[PDB]
């Protein structure tokens, strides 16, 4: 054994499979099903939890025996960090509240954190570091985490320079903090946004085509030093979603314009970085998934609900 | 159109093993009735195939979990009659003791368990107080609690420590009194008998149909007993008497189950007077094996050790149906044995698995409050019921 | 052989060949081979038909009664060109006596509705049917029986391994309990337990 | 007091000790890594050597009905010291 | 060769009743997916139903197409009804199984020999 | 009982998964563990399959 | 013998069907023998207070898995795979490779406490009686992990109580 | 049991006479433990001179 | 200084929810009837607080007793499915805590973690009442140190 | 006049066992609060205590005080906290305490038994024994 160096049998379920990792965060969503994944295909995983012992169960059926092993930590000091990497295959970054929390601010979050576990991890001598970020994180203001986090893929891109660093867009899936927030935003009032009209192109991905990319990114050569994006492969949609997804499934501490700016945020940036084929994976178009996610209603009949179709200008 | 599909219910407090069922019914009445078993099934038959005589005992014992001892003497039997052994007279005792001690226990359950699931939460209480009385004595005896075997073929082994006998004794002593105290508890109390009266009978000639044995046959005419007809241990030679009852009514069979209680302490008492010194295991070396102190300083006794637990005495081949009555009725195993260490095909029968198929007829004619009180009335596990 | 050994009785050995003998005379159509376990067990073996008309005969007859069923079942057994022996077990309420009935079959031929005399036959047969697949022509249902509903193969024969070909889990993606092909964590170790040498004299066979 | 890794593991009576490679290391990383701290080999050579003015000689290993099964042990040859199978325990004929 | 053939006596009556289970299946699948909430459209259903089908369709012997009708007939007459949960419907269908490489240097490049 | 009369081979396809393709099966007589001598293990065809990979866990 | 119940001539009779309509009418059975038989509550109940009283038991009982040494510890195990052999659960491994001194002890000799039924047989085959059934029962492990068994723990075991299982060994050993 | 006045009055009206082993089995009879440690008979065979194991 | 306020708090909620936890039993074989026994009156459960009631809405936490088939499974994870969201699985018994004495042939499914998170395996078959009793305790011993509201505070 | 004896029952152990602020103690520690029954044979901090014989069933019963292992504290009570002779004679194993019939006192026993290590730093981890397997092959250092 060189690097968990020989896979056996078929995967998953004692299956050796290739890699150890570790996953930051994985305390909610994106981990979850991420480490699902890995385990999923057998492969050892270490996920570092917040103080919080109890809520961590829900990710203990995925991991077998002798995988998925817990240990404390806090981004704050080094020797954590240091002590969970120490033997791994790799390890990936999960990380950051999408509101700002009394210690922590919208800076340090996706700024130190990253600095410290990338730093720690070129010197702990472990490759294909994958670290994400949202989509078009720019520079240019109007949303501060993403300057904010734009300056942390800076960073996280001049220390340890092999790395994948992906851009996911809008992640679209069942406990999701995006589509579930619109569904949500209609109580009373009636004014999430929509405010100008328009001006308002995206394109959410759900999440199983992300977790797949990521899990192909990380057993896969030639996935490292190379930043990419992910894409909706086909819906595209305008503010028409709102309507939509508030159409279907029908009718029954969050933040101000760092939220609703935040949701407000427009653009599919830039069409050349490998999109999706790129790293060999199928994508999911809105509706079925939708359905299952938004559940709700009478559930009583099927009937059509008339698909959305932007496709604006595509 | 009318009718309905209703569901079963996961537990009631006591709950020992889950069924679902379906019930197509009228209102508050219950046309059909379609049980399904095979809930809970661990495939044990198919495990024996794999494992020698020695090994496979253990499911002999857990099959039917609640009374025990007696399905311990059913396999046992099973191997000795097919195995041309016999026990020596002292095992046989102990066998018979533990036997009806076992069927007090599966009896005291059966009927507490079900006064708690039709109400009257406390005689679950006054005599599962006594029951661990009984798991008291297990201990002693087998060194665990319940699943211990504590039985082998070619005989019982590690006999009772000693000054067991005089605890066996004193519980014996007042159960009656206890037992009495229960029966006063009901037993023309308005509530219990009003509501378990005519419900669910059987004709006798249907049960036989259906195959029911047990205080199934007891309680409803047809008088007949396997400890009677064919005795298959010195069982035989101790006194005492069977209940009956001409309403076939499921109170009959009640009072039956409590009055094999009150045989149950006859034979007890006879038992611990006529015990003989006799030995434990049978002597033969091959069968089953030798103490320590032969073990050690003796070669043969040694090999014998060694091979009888790597290998296990081989059983010549044939085909036996052995039973026994066990506190759920008649029980028995089908031994098929080719010429080797391990048995072949070996399916127990579980009464539970007959009179289980019974409530199609029993509960057509009464609501399905009462059709709580049809299935527990004849004693059931779900985990017998299943294999 | 006094001590240490079962006592074995002549008496019910002679009694139950006699009536075995009755059984082969009364009814030449359907009986093959009528033996004694010498322990004294009677056991009739039955072509694969006249399980009615034996059965409709061992209710009756009044010199023989049988009315309670003990238990059906079946034996796995290869190397025959029929798999599957179909064993009647019966016990007679009035003279203290049980005999067996022994029959055959393959898999495609089926067995015929023993329903129609023991109403205990009824479920016996489905269990067979699930945990064999033994076909049984015109049962008045057919379901399953101690194995799980969207379940196959049938598994109590010997080309079934002692492991499935599926387990269950449960994953945060489907949220739903789901299968794959079984994985073991520890291999089953197999034991080999089988000595040579012929322990029983007796029931050796011919050498060719 | 056990010979210890350069890692700071404490190798076994069977050498176990993981490579600093290995991955599974991890697996003790905030708990313990337990060994019986008292080895066995290290017990036998603290036995004294037992001595019998007889030939042949016998070992219950300590006492009848507990113990190993009896086996009778030939001290002929001097050159070496006869051990027990079971036991370990030395003995010789004296001179 | 002699036999005990069970509800036909050639292949004729056979297909004539496959031909009715798949009837009978082509009727009961959108009650089925609305019934259980599953996520899948009727059409895709329907389509691994007739794969389903074309599994065995290389059958020759009456009898074991008899008998394979027995089991659609059988397990249609637990979906018909609500006797098996969403679980097992859905288990027909595999999202959890990891895609198998059915190529030789994929197959060769991890299975060793599989 | 017309008993119709067929004649072709006779397959299985009301048993397990993909295994039957890939998997060659073996017949022999075990041949006597030469560390004893006696011939009660042989006598008795046997069928056992092409083994396959085993890891440590 | 049948000596059968609920046969029986209920008296239409008077003086008995007084005592019917008083019966059925007053309630006097259900009150007076119910009410009172439970009124019998003075009685002290039976309970033990777990963490400051236990329960009786026997010196046959089966607790976990401690391996035993010899006086001068050896290891009392010689390997010899009957525990293994006979473990209806098949929960047991044994590899065993020749030591230092030549004698033979085990490497790897591993339970799985989930597996195991806790039979007894292990205690019964080892001719030595290495591994005995302990009598103390200490549990509740919070990981599916823990319930595994080392070679290792299971010394440490042996080593945290024996004159325990002295005690009960030298107690029963004249039964076996 | 332990000292009652008027309450064992009361058991003794209702449910009849008692107090012969209360419910709670708690008063001696205990037995000691193995007063005698134990020796066991051993029975037929286990003799010399009477028996080749072919008869038995 | 208001943390004080917090641990105080959390061994309030803590302590009662702790001091009560009255689960549902499952019971579904063998263990059960010992289970049964940790409710009678020798071994009584009552002492400790705990109470015996059966529904999973009501449910405080769940002891999973008896061998879980693989027919049974799925119902069982919704009985876990349906349940207040502060909630804790003991598992009872050999069979249930990693497959027992079947742990092979089909049918039994291994282990209940395969099915839902597990906290307190307490071994035995059946695990004695007392056992199964020094089980439930030491979870209480885990809710002891939840210490679940302070990280909500975040410090 | 009977009950002038009981309320001595229990104002004699209330007065005699602990003192004033003794019931109070022993009352919150274990909610058992028995007539203190004679000694017990102290060894550690945990003290025992076992009855006249007055009854079956709570025969003897114990508190495990504080500051075993030097960890943890009281209100930790639970089992294990008894050392291997008190499990045995507290349990009804053997009539005889371990004071009046003494362990046989090896060598290579704990003299601790500590506590139960289920959470903790301190917790057991099951892992592999023996030793690899192949012992996989190396090229040479040196070039050609
Ligand atoms: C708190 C501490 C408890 C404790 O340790 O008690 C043990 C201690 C003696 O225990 P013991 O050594 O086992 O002796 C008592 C017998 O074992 C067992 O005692 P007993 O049950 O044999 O004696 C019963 C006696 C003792 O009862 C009383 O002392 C209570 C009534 C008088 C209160 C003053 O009852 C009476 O004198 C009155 C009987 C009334 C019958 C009808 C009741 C109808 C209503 C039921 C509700 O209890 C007392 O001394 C009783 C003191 C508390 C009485 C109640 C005070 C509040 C009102
Ligand atoms: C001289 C001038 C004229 C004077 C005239 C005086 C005439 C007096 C004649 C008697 C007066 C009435 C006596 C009480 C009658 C009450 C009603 C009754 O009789 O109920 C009996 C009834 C019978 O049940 P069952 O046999 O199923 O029904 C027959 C239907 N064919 O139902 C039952 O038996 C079942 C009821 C069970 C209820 C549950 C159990 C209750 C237990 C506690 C009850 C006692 C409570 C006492 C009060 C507490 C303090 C307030
Ligand atoms: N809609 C979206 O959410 C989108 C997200 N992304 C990217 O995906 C990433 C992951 O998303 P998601 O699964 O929803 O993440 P979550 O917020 O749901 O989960 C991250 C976990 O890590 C914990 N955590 C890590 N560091 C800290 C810290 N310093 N302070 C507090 N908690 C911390 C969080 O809280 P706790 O400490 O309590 O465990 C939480 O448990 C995001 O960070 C973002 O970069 C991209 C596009 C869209
Ligand atoms: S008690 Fe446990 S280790 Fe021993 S034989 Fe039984 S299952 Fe195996
Ligand atoms: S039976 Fe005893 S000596 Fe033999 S391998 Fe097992 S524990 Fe060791
Ligand atoms: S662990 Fe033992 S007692 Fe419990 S359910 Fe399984 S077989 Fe029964
Ligand atoms: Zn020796």
């Not at chain 1, 977790?211 to 894409?231: C, E, H, L, Y």
């Not at chain 7, 029986?8 to 023998?33: C, F, H, N, Y």
């Not at chain 7, 109940?45 to 040494?69: M, V």
């Not at chain 7, 001194?101 to 290495?130: H, L, N, W």
Request: charged share 25%.
């Amino acid at each position: 054994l060189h690097h968990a160096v020989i896979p056996h049998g078929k995967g998953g379920r004692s299956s050796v499979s290739g890699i150890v990792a570790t996953v930051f965060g994985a305390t909610g969503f994106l981990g979850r099903y991420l480490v699902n994944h890995l385990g999923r295909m057998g492969s050892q995983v270490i996920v570092p939890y917040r103080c919080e012992p109890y809520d961590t169960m829900h990710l203990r059926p995925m991991g077998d025996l002798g995988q998925i092993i817990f240990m404390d930590w806090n981004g704050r000091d080094k020797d954590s960090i240091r002590r969970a990497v120490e033997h791994s295959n790799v390890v990936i970054n999960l990380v950051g509240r999408e509101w700002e929390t009394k210690n922590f601010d919208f800076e340090d979050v996706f700024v130190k954190i990253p600095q410290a576990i990338a730093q720690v991890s070129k010197e702990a001598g472990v490759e294909k570091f994958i670290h994400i970020s949202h989509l078009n994180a720019d520079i240019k203001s109007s949303s501060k985490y993403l300057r904010n986090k734009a300056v942390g893929e800076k960073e996280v891109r001049e220390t340890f320079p092999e790395a994948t660093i992906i851009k996911p867009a809008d992640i679209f899936g069942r406990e999701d903090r995006f589509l579930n927030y619109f569904a949500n935003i209609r109580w009373f009032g009636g004014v999430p946004l929509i405010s100008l009209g328009k001006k308002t192109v995206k394109q959410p991905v759900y999440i199983v085509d992300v977790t797949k990319g990521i899990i192909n990114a990380i057993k896969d050569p030639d996935a490292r030093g190379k930043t990419f994006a992910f894409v909706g492969p086909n819906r595209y949609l305008l503010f028409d979603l709102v309507q939509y997804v508030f159409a279907v499934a029908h009718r029954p501490p969050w933040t101000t314009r760092d939220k609703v700016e935040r949701i407000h945020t427009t653009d599919r940036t830039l069409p050349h970085l490998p999109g999706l084929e790129d790293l060999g994976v199928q994508a999911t178009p809105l509706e079925l998934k939708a359905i299952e996610v938004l559940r709700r209603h009478r559930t009583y009949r099927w009937l059509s609900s008339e698909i959305e179709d932007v496709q604006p200008a595509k | 159109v009318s009718n309905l599909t209703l569901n079963f219910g996961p537990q009631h407090p006591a709950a020992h093993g889950v069924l679902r069922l379906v019930m197509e019914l009228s209102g508050e009445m219950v046309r059909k009735c379609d049980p399904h078993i095979g809930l809970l099934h661990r495939g044990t038959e198919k495990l024996i195939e794999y494992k020698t005589y020695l090994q496979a005992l253990p499911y002999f014992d857990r099959l039917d979990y609640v009374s025990m001892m007696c399905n311990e003497q059913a396999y046992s039997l099973a191997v000795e009659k097919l195995l041309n052994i016999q026990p020596p007279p002292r095992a046989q005792w102990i066998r018979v003791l533990f036997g009806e001690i076992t069927r007090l226990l599966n009896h005291i359950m059966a009927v507490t368990t079900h006064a708690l699931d039709i109400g009257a939460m406390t005689p679950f209480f006054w005599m599962f107080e006594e029951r661990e009385k009984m798991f008291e004595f297990y201990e002693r005896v087998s060194g665990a609690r319940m699943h211990a075997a504590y039985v082998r073929p070619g005989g019982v082994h590690q006999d009772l420590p000693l000054g067991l006998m005089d605890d066996i004794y004193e519980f014996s002593k007042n159960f009656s009194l206890r037992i009495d105290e229960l029966e006063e508890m009901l037993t023309n109390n308005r509530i219990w008998r009003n509501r378990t009266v005519d419900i669910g009978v059987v004709t006798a000639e249907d049960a036989l149909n259906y195959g029911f044995s047990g205080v199934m046959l007891r309680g409803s005419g047809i008088q007949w007993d396997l400890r009677k007809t064919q005795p298959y241990d010195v069982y035989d030679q101790v006194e005492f008497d069977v209940p009956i009852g001409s309403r076939g009514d499921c109170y009959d069979r009640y009072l039956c189950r409590v009055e094999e209680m009150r045989q149950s302490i006859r034979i007890i008492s006879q038992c611990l007077n006529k015990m003989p010194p006799g030995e434990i295991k049978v002597d033969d070396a091959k069968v089953s094996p030798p103490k320590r102190a032969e073990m050690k300083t003796s070669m043969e006794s040694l090999i014998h050790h060694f091979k009888l637990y790597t290998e296990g005495y081989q059983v010549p081949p044939g085909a036996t149906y052995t039973a026994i009555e066990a506190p759920k009725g008649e029980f028995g195993v089908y031994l098929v044995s080719d010429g080797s260490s391990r048995p072949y095909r070996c399916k127990i029968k579980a009464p539970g698995f007959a009179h289980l198929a019974g409530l199609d007829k029993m509960s057509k004619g009464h609501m399905l409050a009462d059709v709580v009180a049809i299935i527990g009335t004849q004693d059931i596990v779900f985990g017998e019921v299943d294999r | 052989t006094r001590p240490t050994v079962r006592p074995r009785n002549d008496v019910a050995h002679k009694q139950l060949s006699a009536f075995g003998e009755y059984v082969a005379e009364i009814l030449p159509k359907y009986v093959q081979q009528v033996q004694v376990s010498c322990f004294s067990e009677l056991e009739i073996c039955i072509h694969p038909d006249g399980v009615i008309p034996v059965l409709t005969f061992l209710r009756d007859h009044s010199n023989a009664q049988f009315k309670s069923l003990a238990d059906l079942t079946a034996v796995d057994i290869p190397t025959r060109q029929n798999r599957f022996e179909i064993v009647y077990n019966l016990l007679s309420l009035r003279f203290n006596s049980r005999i067996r009935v022994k029959t055959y079959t393959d898999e495609l031929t089926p067995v015929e509705s023993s329903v129609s005399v023991y109403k205990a036959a009824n479920w016996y047969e489905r269990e067979i049917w699930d945990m064999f697949g033994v076909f049984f022509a015109n049962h008045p249902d057919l379901r399953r029986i101690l194995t799980d509903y969207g379940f196959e193969g049938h598994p109590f024969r010997k080309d079934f391994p002692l492991s499935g070909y599926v387990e269950l889990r449960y994953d945060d993606e489907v949220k739903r309990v789901v299968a794959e092909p079984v994985e073991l964590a520890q291999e089953f170790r197999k034991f080999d337990l089988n000595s040579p040498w012929e322990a029983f004299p007796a029931y050796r066979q011919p050498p060719e | 007091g056990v010979r210890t890794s350069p890692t700071g593991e404490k190798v076994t009576h069977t050498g176990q000790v993981y490579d600093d490679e290995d991955y599974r290391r991890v697996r003790f990383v905030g708990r313990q890594k337990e060994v019986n701290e008292n080895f066995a080999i290290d017990l036998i050579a603290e036995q004294p050597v037992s001595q019998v003015g007889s030939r042949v000689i016998s070992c219950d290993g300590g006492g009848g009905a507990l113990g190993h099964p009896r086996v009778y042990i030939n001290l002929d040859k001097e050159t070496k010291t006869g051990t027990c199978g079971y036991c370990g325990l030395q003995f010789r004929q004296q001179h | 060769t002699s036999v005990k053939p069970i509800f036909s006596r050639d292949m004729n009556e056979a297909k004539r009743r496959v031909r009715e289970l798949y009837r009978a299946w082509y009727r009961e699948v959108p009650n089925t997916v609305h019934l259980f909430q599953l996520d899948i459209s009727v059409k895709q259903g329907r389509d691994k139903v007739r794969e389903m089908f074309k599994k065995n369709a290389h059958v020759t012997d009456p009898r074991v197409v008899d008998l394979l009708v027995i089991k659609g007939k059988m397990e249609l007459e637990e979906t018909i009804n609500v006797w098996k949960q969403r679980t097992h419907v859905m288990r027909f269908f595999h999202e959890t199984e990891a895609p198998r490489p059915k190529d030789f240097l994929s197959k060769f490049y991890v299975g060793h020999d599989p | 009982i017309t008993v119709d009369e067929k004649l072709d081979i006779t397959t299985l396809t009301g048993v397990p998964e993909e295994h039957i393709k890939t998997r060659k099966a073996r017949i022999f007589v075990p041949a006597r563990n030469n560390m004893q001598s006696g011939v009660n293990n042989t006598k008795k065809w046997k069928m056992e399959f092409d083994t396959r990979e085993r890891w440590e866990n | 013998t049948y000596k059968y119940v609920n046969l029986r001539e209920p008296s239409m009779d008077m003086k008995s069907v007084t005592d019917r309509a008083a019966q059925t009418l007053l309630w006097t059975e259900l009150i007076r023998g119910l009410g009172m038989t439970l009124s019998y509550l003075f009685r002290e109940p039976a309970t033990i207070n777990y963490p400051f009283e236990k329960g009786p038991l026997s010196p046959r009982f089966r607790g976990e898995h401690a391996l035993r040494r010899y006086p001068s510890g050896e290891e009392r195990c010689i390997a010899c795979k009957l525990c293994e052999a006979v473990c209806p659960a098949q929960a047991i491994t044994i590899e065993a490779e020749p030591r230092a001194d030549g004698s033979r002890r085990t490497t790897r000799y591993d339970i799985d406490m989930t597996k195991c039924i806790y039979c007894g047989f292990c205690q019964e085959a080892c001719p030595v009686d290495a591994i005995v059934e302990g009598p103390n029962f200490e549990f509740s492990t919070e990981t599916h992990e823990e319930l595994l068994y080392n070679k290792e723990k299971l010394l440490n075991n042996g080593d945290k109580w024996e004159a325990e299982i002295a005690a009960n060994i030298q107690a029963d050993y004249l039964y076996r | 049991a332990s000292a009652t006045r008027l309450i064992q009055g009361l058991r003794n009206w209702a449910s009849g006479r008692d107090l012969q082993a209360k419910l709670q089995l708690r008063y001696q009879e205990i037995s000691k433990r193995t007063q005698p440690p134990p020796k066991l008979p051993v029975g037929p065979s286990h003799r010399l001179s009477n028996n080749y194991y072919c008869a038995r | 200084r208001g943390e004080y306020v917090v641990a105080k708090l959390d061994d309030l909620i803590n302590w009662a929810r702790r001091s009560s936890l009255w689960p549902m039993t499952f019971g579904l074989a063998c263990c059960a009837v010992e289970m049964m026994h940790m409710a009678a009156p020798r071994y009584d459960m009552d002492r400790f607080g705990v109470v015996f009631r059966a529904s999973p809405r009501q449910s405080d936490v769940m002891i999973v007793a008896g061998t879980l088939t693989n027919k049974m499974a799925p119902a069982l994870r919704k009985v876990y499915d349906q349940m207040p969201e502060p909630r804790y699985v003991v598992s009872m018994g050999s069979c249930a805590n990693g497959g027992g004495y079947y742990h092979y042939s089909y049918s039994v499914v291994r282990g209940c973690d395969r099915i839902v998170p597990v906290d307190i395996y307490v071994p035995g078959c059946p695990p004695t009442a007392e056992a199964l009793l020094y089980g439930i305790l030491q979870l209480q011993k885990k809710i002891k140190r939840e210490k679940r509201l302070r990280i909500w505070y975040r410090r | 006049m009977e009950l002038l004896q009981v309320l001595k029952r229990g104002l004699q152990q209330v007065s005699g066992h602990g003192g004033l602020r003794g019931y109070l103690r022993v009352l919150f520690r274990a909610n058992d609060v028995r007539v203190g029954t004679l000694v017990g044979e102290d060894k550690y901090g945990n003290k025992y205590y076992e009855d006249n014989k007055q009854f079956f069933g709570r025969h003897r019963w114990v508190i495990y005080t504080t500051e075993m292992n030097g960890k943890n504290t009281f209100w930790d009570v639970d089992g294990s906290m008894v050392p291997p002779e008190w499990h045995r004679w507290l349990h009804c194993m053997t009539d005889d305490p371990p004071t009046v019939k003494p362990p046989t006192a090896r060598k290579f026993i704990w003299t601790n038994h500590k506590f139960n290590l289920s959470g903790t730093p301190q917790q057991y981890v099951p892992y592999s024994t023996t030793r690899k397997k192949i012992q996989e092959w190396v090229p040479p250092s040196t070039p050609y």
